[PDB]
Amino acid sequence: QAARLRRRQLIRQLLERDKTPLAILFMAAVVGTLVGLAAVAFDKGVAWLQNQRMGALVHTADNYPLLLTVAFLCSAVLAMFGYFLVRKYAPEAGGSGIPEIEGALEDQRPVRWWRVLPVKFFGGLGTLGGGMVLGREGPTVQIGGNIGRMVLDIFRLKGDEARHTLLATGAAAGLAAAFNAPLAGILFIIEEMRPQFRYTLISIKAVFIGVIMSTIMYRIFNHEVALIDVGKLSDAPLNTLWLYLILGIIFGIFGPIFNKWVLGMQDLLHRVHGGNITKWVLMGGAIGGLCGLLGFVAPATSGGGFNLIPIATAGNFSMGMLVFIFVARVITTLLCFSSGAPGGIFAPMLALGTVLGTAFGMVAVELFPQYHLEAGTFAIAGMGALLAASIRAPLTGIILVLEMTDNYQLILPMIITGLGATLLAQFTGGKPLYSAILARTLAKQEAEQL
Amino acid sequence: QAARLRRRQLIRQLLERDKTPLAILFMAAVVGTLVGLAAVAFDKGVAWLQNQRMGALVHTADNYPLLLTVAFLCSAVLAMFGYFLVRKYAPEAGGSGIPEIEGALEDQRPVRWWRVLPVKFFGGLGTLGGGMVLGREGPTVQIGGNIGRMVLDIFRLKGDEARHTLLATGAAAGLAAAFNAPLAGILFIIEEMRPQFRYTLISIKAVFIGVIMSTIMYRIFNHEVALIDVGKLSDAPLNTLWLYLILGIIFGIFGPIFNKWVLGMQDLLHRVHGGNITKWVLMGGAIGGLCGLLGFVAPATSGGGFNLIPIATAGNFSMGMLVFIFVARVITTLLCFSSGAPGGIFAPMLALGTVLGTAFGMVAVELFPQYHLEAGTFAIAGMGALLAASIRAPLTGIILVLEMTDNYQLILPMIITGLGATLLAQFTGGKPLYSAILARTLAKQEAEQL
């Protein structure tokens, strides 16, 4: 056999490793600064909207049915202003965004930044300030993916590598500005969002440059870095690593069930309006008002969830309220994500996995006194376990939980739960969510024009 | 016309995603157990030989003529026992072994588990018990990859997915049980040792199971993980982040010079013996004796390098001793890696980066009193900087220094120094060392084929 032809080119391919050009390496530092300054403005707008809501709630709080009407309408109008821009100006904007940038990294789903930027920035603000149960990473990864195409057409940058290493750098530097997690930005773009079947040139050094130039510009403005404020929990002993495997089994069984429910509620809600704009924007306003009424009364069954993760993880939640929080959050996460709204389910998945981890830990510390357990270790171990069973990005989820909760002493329970989740999500017929939505929007577009 | 015809295939590929068969997932659960049980025996053999060397030399401490010759001969015999078992039986076990495993993950430079595995475990245990400046990283990655090839032929398993997966999960469980770093072990296999040009189906759900079934088998026997035992260092505010870029620039200008020195000392020492085994085993014994000598007199310029790191990072190293450690540690590191000894240069880079970071911080806190700095922050930020300059895999270096030091809050000073080292290693004209040793061995194999 003449097998000295492949080796003779591997000789000259191994020496030319990591040779990214300066014309890409500088535009990475440009797109990272742009997505940092965009995500900072998005966070400082969604904070100002919630401040203006909760400053007008307690201002006139004498007449309770009028106050409930105010808390309904002040969220419903901002939700209608977030559904109308999506249904009129950019139909590819409504959703998690990551199923669109994951398609854009495989040369389908064309990025039109001139109409996805002032829709996912000015309607995503309106539908996340209303208090709907969504996280601000959908309209940050999608906005960064549009900025990664904005500074490729505004600079007339030729090439085929340079599109996929800037459209991915801006996307990966949005999840590093939404969660204040630099490592999660790279380990999301090299593990889940990359083309998983073919070979593509995405320069990891440009990804690093964009991620740190977005994280610096995030930490310059958003000071007092207290995104998740769990304490230091007890280290998990080695003789009780088998409980974080049963927690992984529970999460990996629940994972494809939640994955089927999310993909079924879209097709169930797709026939209550049928595609009409004046009925879609009026159904979305009602759902955004129902997610503001539940933000005013029973304040745990709403919001991005980031305010109830420190109240969990060995906190004061009894189980009779902790199962109600889980039911009323799994009934409102897939009711305000699976309706065509700007906003991706990462934060209302972390807020679901944390509640279920606490609900398992409250049983495991009662049944097992001889282990001297702590009921908050299972919450950190199961925070990134619905993200490792429905999104099926366990290396991203474990690193993200390590980034934002700082507890390293239970890294082995984190990875045991994250690999007990993916195994029984695979063995029970479960697809990854951000690929099963991409395979749906690439089949609807296929059956539209054959 | 390759848009719809690729859509029809991409839908079917996205639906059938992340579906590794159970045979590879069980063989990768039995690989990691054997790799952990072999790394534990390797560590307990080298920590027995170093103990029964240092406690046996002290039986005669009055005769200072006799003591130096005892500390020389008792280390030179164990070095010759490594340089003989490498040369006579398995000549590919010399050097590190990682640029042989990452070559064997590209369908050439094959794995010989029946020849290398009782060479890298015995000659490696000899030449690391001799006190030489090598890590237990090469002899654990290569032993892991060859164990993962051993149980691919014991069980008669087939395929090109299973071969690459069981060859990658053993070498990813080697780094996870060599450094007690269950995240750096996989972040080495998805960044450095994978083939970077073609697309091979390394199943990451089976790499992770081999990692978490090996970290457990390490943690059962080796409690009290104290490879690095730095405290809780002070955080680095935003006005001092430009110093961890000058540190990255210094490391990126040192990296290619260190790779040139490594690749030049090999071609210089290859003219001493000329390939003769009876001269190689007699030269390498005298080379390894000048680390069992330095382990007795001035014991910091010897050893694996996981000592002296808590003595650095804001410790009692003065600058006049810290320049001597760096000028007399590089010499032995070159002399004992580029001579054919079984041992990887991955640990004597994590102890050169710490010394250079401390020597930078000790002048930073002298020159900038208005910043209120600390020399340990530069040390932890520059520990995984030569690993990003020379090996040019910055992500696993940042993850590894996050693993073993457990200082998280300087993650931005770590990652800035990492990418600033990789950039200035690219612009100066540097190549990755683990892809310059492989592209030298393959060029020797080609030019020897008459």
Side-chain angles (χ1 to χ4, degrees):
Chain A
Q1 205 186 20
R4 310 146 302 163
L5 177 49
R6 193 184 146 272
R7 195 180 50 177
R8 210 155 64 247
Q9 90 195 39
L10 195 86
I11 281 296
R12 74 163 62 98
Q13 274 176 357
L14 284 167
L15 302 169
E16 265 76 12
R17 182 169 176 255
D18 263 350
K19 300 294 281 293
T20 309
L22 191 73
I24 280 171
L25 288 180
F26 175 67
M27 298 330 164
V30 177
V31 67
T33 320
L34 260 71
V35 67
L37 294 197
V40 157
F42 194 76
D43 289 30
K44 294 192 81 168
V46 78
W48 188 82
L49 275 192
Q50 296 188 167
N51 265 332
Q52 272 291 132
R53 289 198 313 120
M54 269 86 79
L57 260 289
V58 310
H59 182 50
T60 47
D62 57 345
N63 183 20
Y64 199 61
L66 171 144
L67 171 79
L68 258 69
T69 299
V70 162
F72 193 85
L73 295 189
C74 187
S75 196
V77 174
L78 298 182
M80 285 162 59
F81 201 64
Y83 275 89
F84 181 53
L85 315 176
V86 155
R87 275 299 113 185
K88 201 78 163 187
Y89 296 151
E92 54 182 354
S96 194
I98 304 171
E100 303 292 325
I101 321 291
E102 193 166 316
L105 261 69
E106 300 147 356
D107 269 355
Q108 284 101 11
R109 295 309 300 191
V111 167
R112 299 170 295 157
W113 40 270
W114 58 88
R115 66 177 63 248
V116 193
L117 277 193
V119 161
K120 289 298 279 291
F121 196 78
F122 271 103
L125 211 71
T127 183
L128 293 192
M132 317 182 67
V133 198
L134 310 162
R136 54 173 198 269
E137 51 92 17
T140 319
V141 171
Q142 164 90 73
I143 275 186
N146 309 139
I147 290 174
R149 201 63 213 272
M150 175 173 169
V151 293
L152 193 88
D153 190 75
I154 212 174
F155 287 152
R156 293 144 280 168
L157 206 59
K158 297 296 177 184
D160 208 4
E161 161 191 16
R163 160 184 41 219
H164 296 167
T165 185
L166 257 56
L167 168 57
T169 289
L175 193 142
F179 287 121
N180 204 342
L183 287 166
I186 300 110
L187 274 79
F188 194 53
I189 205 68
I190 74 174
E191 207 265 334
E192 215 274 339
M193 260 192 64
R194 52 150 279 146
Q196 292 280 109
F197 319 108
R198 25 176 283 175
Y199 156 73
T200 45
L201 271 165
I202 293 173
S203 50
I204 319 291
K205 298 151 66 168
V207 175
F208 272 110
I209 287 160
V211 163
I212 71 147
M213 214 53 64
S214 158
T215 305
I216 287 178
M217 277 296 179
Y218 178 75
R219 290 188 196 185
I220 276 174
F221 298 97
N222 267 315
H223 205 75
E224 202 278 315
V225 283
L227 193 48
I228 285 300
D229 281 347
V230 305
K232 165 67 75 169
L233 305 178
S234 165
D235 57 329
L238 211 67
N239 70 315
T240 170
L241 280 185
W242 68 282
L243 282 170
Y244 310 98
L245 177 58
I246 307 180
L247 189 51
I249 279 174
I250 290 306
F251 267 116
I253 281 177
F254 179 58
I257 290 289
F258 188 68
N259 197 4
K260 183 248 163 191
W261 281 342
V262 163
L263 295 171
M265 194 60 77
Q266 272 158 1
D267 310 332
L268 168 57
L269 278 191
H270 195 273
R271 64 183 180 179
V272 76
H273 51 263
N276 202 352
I277 312 287
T278 177
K279 213 173 296 184
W280 201 322
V281 81
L282 194 145
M283 183 263 309
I287 283 185
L290 194 47
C291 278
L293 200 63
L294 292 201
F296 173 54
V297 304
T301 81
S302 163
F306 277 167
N307 53 4
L308 67 99
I309 309 175
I311 317 186
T313 79
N316 51 306
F317 282 162
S318 65
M319 205 167 159
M321 206 202 316
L322 200 57
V323 75
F324 158 73
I325 280 170
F326 185 76
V327 167
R329 195 161 209 90
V330 79
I331 209 172
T332 56
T333 287
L334 55 89
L335 208 72
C336 85
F337 165 68
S338 66
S339 82
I345 41 171
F346 269 176
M349 275 186 166
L350 297 192
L352 273 191
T354 287
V355 163
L356 189 43
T358 318
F360 179 66
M362 211 159 307
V363 170
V365 73
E366 166 68 34
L367 295 176
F368 294 147
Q370 78 252 24
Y371 288 180
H372 273 77
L373 268 184
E374 173 157 352
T377 321
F378 296 94
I380 307 298
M383 181 159 149
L386 214 52
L387 203 146
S390 200
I391 312 295
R392 313 272 290 271
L395 191 59
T396 303
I398 287 152
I399 278 293
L400 167 69
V401 169
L402 203 68
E403 280 308 288
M404 71 198 314
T405 60
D406 211 4
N407 298 3
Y408 176 68
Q409 67 265 352
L410 60 147
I411 187 55
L412 197 48
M414 286 179 186
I415 60 192
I416 278 173
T417 303
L419 263 291
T422 316
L423 277 199
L424 274 79
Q426 173 207 322
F427 295 154
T428 44
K431 275 88 189 171
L433 171 67
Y434 284 153
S435 281
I437 302 178
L438 180 51
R440 185 178 296 274
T441 182
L442 285 182
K444 182 66 188 72
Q445 199 192 13
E446 181 60 43
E448 207 192 300
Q449 322 101 308
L450 280 77
Chain B
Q1 266 292 324
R4 185 188 285 107
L5 320 173
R6 194 176 63 191
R7 267 182 194 161
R8 291 172 161 187
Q9 189 256 15
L10 195 60
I11 285 175
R12 199 264 314 276
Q13 268 190 314
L14 282 165
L15 287 185
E16 293 287 324
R17 195 165 87 88
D18 212 50
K19 202 171 286 294
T20 297
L22 192 146
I24 313 177
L25 284 171
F26 182 47
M27 289 321 127
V30 80
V31 159
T33 301
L34 289 169
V35 178
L37 273 164
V40 164
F42 193 50
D43 293 0
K44 293 173 68 170
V46 67
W48 172 62
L49 257 179
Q50 278 186 326
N51 171 259
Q52 268 300 127
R53 215 186 72 226
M54 293 185 287
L57 60 95
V58 303
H59 280 308
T60 317
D62 204 358
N63 214 355
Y64 208 63
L66 183 83
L67 185 42
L68 276 295
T69 75
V70 159
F72 186 72
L73 291 190
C74 176
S75 181
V77 164
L78 304 171
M80 290 167 47
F81 199 69
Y83 283 106
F84 179 48
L85 295 194
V86 158
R87 276 291 106 187
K88 193 71 168 306
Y89 293 118
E92 51 202 347
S96 187
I98 314 179
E100 200 262 357
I101 287 303
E102 86 177 50
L105 285 171
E106 270 178 329
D107 303 2
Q108 45 201 4
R109 192 75 264 167
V111 190
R112 305 200 300 179
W113 58 268
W114 64 97
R115 188 74 77 87
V116 171
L117 210 67
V119 157
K120 210 69 182 300
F121 196 74
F122 282 169
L125 190 136
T127 199
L128 275 169
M132 288 170 56
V133 280
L134 295 168
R136 46 188 61 83
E137 182 59 43
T140 313
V141 160
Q142 199 161 25
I143 277 183
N146 299 20
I147 276 176
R149 189 61 143 85
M150 170 196 101
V151 52
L152 179 72
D153 294 358
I154 288 285
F155 275 62
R156 312 162 212 92
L157 196 60
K158 74 207 79 181
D160 276 281
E161 175 195 26
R163 171 198 323 276
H164 292 168
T165 309
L166 285 188
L167 195 40
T169 183
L175 198 144
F179 287 160
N180 205 352
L183 272 158
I186 180 173
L187 281 152
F188 204 50
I189 209 71
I190 72 171
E191 196 200 13
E192 183 65 13
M193 277 197 283
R194 57 159 287 121
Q196 309 283 342
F197 324 111
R198 27 186 278 169
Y199 168 72
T200 71
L201 302 103
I202 301 171
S203 182
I204 212 56
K205 218 184 308 181
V207 171
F208 224 119
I209 285 179
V211 168
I212 74 177
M213 280 298 288
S214 160
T215 319
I216 288 180
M217 289 294 179
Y218 178 77
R219 280 190 204 256
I220 283 174
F221 296 99
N222 298 23
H223 298 121
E224 192 263 335
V225 47
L227 302 181
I228 309 299
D229 208 357
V230 296
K232 252 287 180 177
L233 293 170
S234 315
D235 59 343
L238 298 176
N239 43 355
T240 75
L241 286 177
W242 72 280
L243 284 91
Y244 317 103
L245 186 64
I246 311 297
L247 184 59
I249 278 180
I250 291 303
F251 265 99
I253 214 165
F254 180 60
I257 319 185
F258 187 72
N259 279 167
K260 179 56 182 62
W261 279 333
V262 163
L263 294 159
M265 203 64 171
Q266 215 154 7
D267 304 339
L268 167 64
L269 279 164
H270 212 89
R271 306 179 60 238
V272 170
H273 46 261
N276 209 334
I277 174 169
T278 178
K279 284 176 163 37
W280 205 323
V281 299
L282 190 62
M283 188 223 69
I287 295 302
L290 259 66
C291 300
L293 207 72
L294 311 182
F296 168 66
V297 53
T301 182
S302 177
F306 275 160
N307 211 30
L308 84 94
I309 301 189
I311 312 184
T313 78
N316 42 297
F317 277 165
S318 78
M319 193 60 177
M321 201 66 68
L322 213 45
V323 58
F324 169 71
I325 283 305
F326 198 80
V327 71
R329 182 68 190 268
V330 162
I331 292 181
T332 71
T333 303
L334 303 194
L335 204 51
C336 288
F337 169 65
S338 62
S339 66
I345 177 177
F346 207 99
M349 294 168 165
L350 291 159
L352 282 179
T354 297
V355 161
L356 188 49
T358 309
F360 187 71
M362 279 206 58
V363 75
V365 305
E366 182 260 332
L367 197 147
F368 291 112
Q370 71 270 15
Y371 275 159
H372 300 343
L373 270 170
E374 192 190 353
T377 311
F378 293 93
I380 306 299
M383 176 197 288
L386 195 43
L387 282 193
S390 83
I391 308 192
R392 294 267 282 269
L395 181 55
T396 172
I398 300 305
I399 289 293
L400 177 59
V401 174
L402 199 65
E403 284 310 276
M404 48 178 43
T405 77
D406 215 350
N407 270 117
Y408 169 67
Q409 75 272 353
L410 46 94
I411 186 73
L412 203 50
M414 278 186 280
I415 197 174
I416 283 177
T417 311
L419 62 90
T422 314
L423 287 200
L424 267 296
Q426 178 195 352
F427 297 148
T428 321
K431 285 157 299 182
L433 176 62
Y434 284 160
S435 293
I437 295 277
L438 173 61
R440 161 193 299 263
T441 317
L442 293 173
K444 170 188 281 189
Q445 200 73 32
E446 172 199 359
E448 204 56 29
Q449 281 188 208
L450 52 96

